[model samples]
Target: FNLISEKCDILSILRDHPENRIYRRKIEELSKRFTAIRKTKGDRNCFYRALGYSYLESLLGKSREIFKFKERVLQTPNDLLAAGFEEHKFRNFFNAFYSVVELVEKDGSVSSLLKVFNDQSASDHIVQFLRLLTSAFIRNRADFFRHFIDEEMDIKDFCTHEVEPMATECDHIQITALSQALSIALQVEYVDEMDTALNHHVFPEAATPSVYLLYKTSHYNILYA
Candidate 1:
């Protein structure tokens, strides 16, 4: 099954609500800023899958950015280890991520990336690895993250149940942690019918956003200008 869908006009979403004025207007307003969106499977891993694909897509042909990203990717194993993950447990997951990274680093085209992401096993593994990375990042910075975790669970328990689990659906905390974990700045443009203004947020605050996402209700999709 293809984990991600091919790019479609941002206005395509309006097709689903042919008679709704608010929805049509909002999407039309969005069209002025974003040209297209690549939909992904709504298997609860959409955010990670969208993010992974979009970030790599953005890095294509950009040598300096790719080099810096590769350096960060190389350091992830040590970061995972320091956060108490067993090498044997995370090895395969890490390899899946690195494999895709190397593919982009070796000049693979967008079609090649689409091929890899469509493979269920590889696609899911990459998502799991990202979930693990998010958990590890939050765990390592437990003191700082503890306050933000307003739930009954402590930081450790939160990571174990909420962050590490597959397809758990991400929230603000994970987004912030993952952005900082990979050192890839992100901007999420929120498109909703209720508001006239299209609100957007940048993770980690004030950083230049390289990866762009469209947030509609609960799901996230890759956005392109």
Candidate 2:
């Protein structure tokens, strides 16, 4: 989507437009303040923050990539021996792969910041900010998640009464929404929100006897098993 480029172009256009002279002046003032902050900091934390913000901006810019899905064939062992299954409808393979990569990249970047800061308070603040931003983005894309769950929950009363209710719960709801939003916004439709939620929260909570039984028998099976 070239969102980074588009953002830069937007700034350039604003800078050159006569009608945007006041806006340009404000931008210049803000830029000066930002420059002063960088100078006073004398470290790259500000730069990293800017980079992180850009990464987030790029995420929204290329939202379509998150939602796009495609069909693909898997070469099973039997298929490898033979002609393989000619018709397997696997979806969002690349989306899933790349999403993992992006997640890892973000984690790594945050880790770098943690090391740079080396303060527990700073690290905690960064993590909190990340969580907040992630949650906000997910909440903004609620419609997409609603649509996706509708498609995936094909079983009669299973989806509405069972799946949707669990999905909208306090813990599961936000993360599930985030996962779906990320998938749709990043064109990763085949990426399952249920799987994402299970991996992040359900699995850990599943250790509780009651929660475990419910997750194993109901939630996990409904989505993954």
Candidate 3:
């Protein structure tokens, strides 16, 4: 059985991935603060799981934002409905996710979040809901996200084909919508071929970074810093 472990040194993990040598030095400074990393299942949902876990963990340290996020989540079901999502299709998933947030809001158990976020049944539901949220956000503000697509596809198709599909490796387009939708600053450290070993981009550019991801082509992993 696989399980999430603690204190996974990023440097040590990369030491064996021959190709990652190029980034070894560039990410060294980040290593100072990010001494540990966690492995999430790469079942196409890795990006969302990484973001989901990191987002909640960050919220635990910021009690004030917990309530604010819970409130926003509380209103999201309606947002989905307004976006033409079928209640019959999404209600159960919404409740399951809402229930966990409610429990966390009441200060019941921060630890429970780990369980909630890791269970495949529960986690996938949360991820799908997040897809819906991002979809709705893009549809509502097509003016912003649409320009980037250059009419490759309409917002709805992008969500259905690229954004909402399970196991779809997230890209800049999806992540951009997610960070904006959640109103959390998302900073991604690119770990692919580039002039620099590491590159950082902060979404909602002015917002302070509260969520981080280590991006390699077609995959994302949580980065603790």
Candidate 4:
């Protein structure tokens, strides 16, 4: 355990990822978007947490988006049950996540949303529910997603083993489902080895991605731009 360095900051993580200079330069290149930089824990849940947090943060005072999110969450439970997920399996987590969002609506502030998310139990459960939503979307539309997976695993199995599990890192498949589930485009900027200025990808292959994510192999972090 001691062989691995404890995570310090974004700079530290990027510096240690192979050739140190590459990402350091990337940080500089992206520095212009000052506020675009944000942090989430490096645990497996980083992708969902970052995504959820950034989305909610962006909606802070926007009543329309918040209301729309609440409306969407209300419909999802029925959708999940209709999709064949056991009610008992995800119901509790589902309600808990909804409550956090509803409470934020009541308070009319983003701090409440931030508070629960910063709390491990609330944040993790909210993300768990989000994962379920992603899984349901993939399962419901299996035929379309069939070609994307070259692995021996099928769509349902991929969601069960990879997408639904806690702390599992997300990949393109996840972004696809998450994007469609929320009807939001995901803009991921890749800063991997041999990277140029920055390789940009938009999931669901449509309109400029509003949800920005940073990718380096298996890990992801929320980015503003």
Q: Each prediction's TM-score against the native? A: 0.94, 0.22, 0.87, 0.84
lDDT of 3 by residue, 181-224 (tens): 77778888776655564668898678789887777656677777
Model 1: clashing residue pairs? none
Task: Show where candidate 4 strays beyond 4 Å.
Answer: 1-19, 34-36, 148-153
**Of 1 and 4, the candidate ranking higher by TM-score:** 1
Deviation in angstroms for 145 in model 1? 1.1
lDDT tens digits, residue span 1-225, model 4: 111122233444454555667777887676555344555677878888877877766766678878888888788887688678999899888988778777767875655666777887777788899988988888888877876665355786788899888877777778878888887767787886675776677776757665787777667766654
Could you give candidate 2's per-residue lDDT for residues 110-147 as a string of tens digits?
A: 33332323343443243233333334343344455457
Q: Which stretches of candidate 1 lie over 4 Å from their true place?
A: 147-153, 193-196
Query: Which candidate would rank higher by lDDT, 1 or 3?
Result: 1
Q: CA lDDT, every prediction?
A: 0.87, 0.29, 0.73, 0.73
Q: Which candidate comes out best when scored by TM-score? A: 1
* Candidate 4: worst-modelled 10 consecutive residues by lDDT: 1-10
Q: Which candidate leads in lDDT?
A: 1
Residue 86 of candidate 3: its Cα lDDT?
86
lDDT of 1 by residue, 55-116 (tens): 99988888888888888898999989999999999999999999999999895699999989
What CA RMSD would you report for each candidate? Answer: 1.7, 20.0, 2.4, 4.4
TM-score of 2: 0.22
